[PDB]
Amino acid sequence: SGAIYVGNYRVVNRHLATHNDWANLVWEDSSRDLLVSSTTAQGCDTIARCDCQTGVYYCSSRRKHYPVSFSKPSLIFVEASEYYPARYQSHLMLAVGHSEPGDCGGILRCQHGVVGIVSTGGNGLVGFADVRDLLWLDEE
Numbered sequence: 001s002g003a004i005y006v007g008n009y010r011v012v013n014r015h016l017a018t019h020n021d022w023a024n025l026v027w028e029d030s031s032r033d034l035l036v037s038s039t040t041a042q043g044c045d046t047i048a049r050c051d052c053q054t055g056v057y058y059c060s061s062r063r064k065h066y067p068v069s070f071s072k073p074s075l076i077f078v079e080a081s082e083y084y085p086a087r088y089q090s091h092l093m094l095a096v097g098h099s100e101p102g103d104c105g106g107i108l109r110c111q112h113g114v115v116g117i118v119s120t121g122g123n124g125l126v127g128f129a130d131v132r133d134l135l136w137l138d139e140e
């Protein structure tokens with residue numbers, strides 16, 4: 001589990017979004033496994049605006065932070081999961097690391113801020129849903 005709180009936005013894995021997220025929807029993309037909802041309180045997360053391919057992510061299933069190299073956001077075939085069927089996920093970054101389904105929502109961060117959230121795993125890889133292209137997250 002986990003979310004990004006930036007301004008009056010909450011960024012979650014679309015597959016973990018709650019009744020309140022859907023009732024307060026701003027933007028969602030199934031192909032990206034991303035949902036953004038509106039919040040009463042103001043978040044302090046800052047979104048990275050960069051093409052960093054190094055960062056640190058939090059892995060709940062290890063209670064550990066791991067420094068990783070990750071691929072630039074791309075269209076990647078993702079096998080069926082306890083939560084989606086086999087399909088091309090967009091804006092996905094891959095790293096060598098540990099990721100179980102409950103690791104989704106763990107933050108990948110670089111020195112510029114939040115890069116993305118765990119979305120995929122298996123076969124010794126962790127996939128992060130990129131948020132750095134969502135410029136509108138830094139305003140309104």
Ligand SMILES: O=C(N[C@@H]1CCCNC1)c1ccccc1
Pocket residue numbers: 056057058065106107108109
């Ligand atoms: O959110 C972060 N991790 C903390 C770890 C303890 C509780 N879960 C959040 C995070 C991600 C990347 C780098 C640094 C921190």
Ligand SMILES: [Zn+2]
Pocket residue numbers: 048049050051052110111112113
């Ligand atoms: Zn960066």
